[PDB]
Amino acid sequence: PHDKSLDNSLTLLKEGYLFIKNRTERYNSDLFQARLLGKNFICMTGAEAAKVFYDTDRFQRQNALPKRVQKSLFGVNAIQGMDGSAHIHRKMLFLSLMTPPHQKRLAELMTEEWKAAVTRWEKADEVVLFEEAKEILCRVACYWAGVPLKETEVKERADDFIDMVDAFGAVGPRHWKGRRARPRAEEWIEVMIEDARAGLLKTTSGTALHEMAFHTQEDGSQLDSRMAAIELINVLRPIVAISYFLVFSALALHEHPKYKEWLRSGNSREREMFVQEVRRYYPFGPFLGALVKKDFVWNNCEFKKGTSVLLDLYGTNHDPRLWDHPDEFRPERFAEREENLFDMIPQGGGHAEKGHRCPGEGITIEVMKASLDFLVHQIEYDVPEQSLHYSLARMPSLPESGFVMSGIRRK
């Protein structure tokens, strides 16, 4: 199939997470050609594609996504555009800081933070879950990475991280908010990187600030103070991004009352399942980009070298070939499902040790289960009349009212 139009890019902006889905349905196929971002593309959807997309003997990420995304979300020349053993080397670094012990540590700081906020929320009129999340995560993330953060600095930093996430799929004021935030974080963090290297800021072995400051590339030399910031930022920023998911976690519990007592009567497993369903059902990761390395043939289609390709993450997550009533929130669909690396890919697919799959899936899940465990057991509240609606054309997406809470009371 081939969309011959000459503005798919503007269209993509109007449809968002449904852009690829809208055409893999129309053209009745798992992939289609289009003209996106100045280049010739091939958008594909589905787990079988994911399997091919993550085949690095066929796909490279270098030169894949536009600079505007680097200049607002990832940073210029960060791990995201890396390929080969160079990428697997920088990648083992992120993993070392995202292991079960850490996850455990992070969910733990959040738990007390959550419990501590209650005394404050019980006195407020309202509370905007998205705003409470932004701060706490930011304050915790730093603490955990060993990055210093003054109380009167949390908001600004918490906000700068988010302006970066909220810019990747936008044009105009929204894009710029992040084209300006980025330069402020890098600056801020590149200083600590330099201070660490001077033994002027205390750093503790095994924490992101330490490991980034002292990492060693294959050639044996260390990262430019600037790149180490960007890389430490690609740890801090993502954790603050868990704000979205957390707002969705609450939102589901509201729109799906029945699942409340379900969780409350259950254990960690009921949570684990309610979380995994939030990561699958709700929009966040739009898709991914890559360049075809060698000319190959798959699904009767010819992929020419240098052709650009988008992997629909949202669509693979809602494809009936892999899920019953994919557009239904059903925590149970996860009871007994064997673990897989391509059926569900909300934070990427395949191996994290062999590819670009998010290495923060553990932390994201662990942090989310905690957040939920709190909303369900520690407090009781009211969801006052508001705008919970969330668009699928806007990327990223979020319940308009940031999810307002009221009459919060200890449980």
Ligand code: HEM
């Ligand atoms: C809050 C929700 C999160 C979402 C939806 C998310 C989503 C994703 C996606 C879709 C990718 C790309 C996969 C690919 O390119 O093939 C990725 C990469 C990555 N994520 Fe996340 N992420 C999240 C949380 C986290 C957390 C909290 C951390 C840090 C602890 C983190 C660290 C990273 C890193 C550094 C990479 C780049 C890996 C590479 O390029 O090889 N993330 N993530």
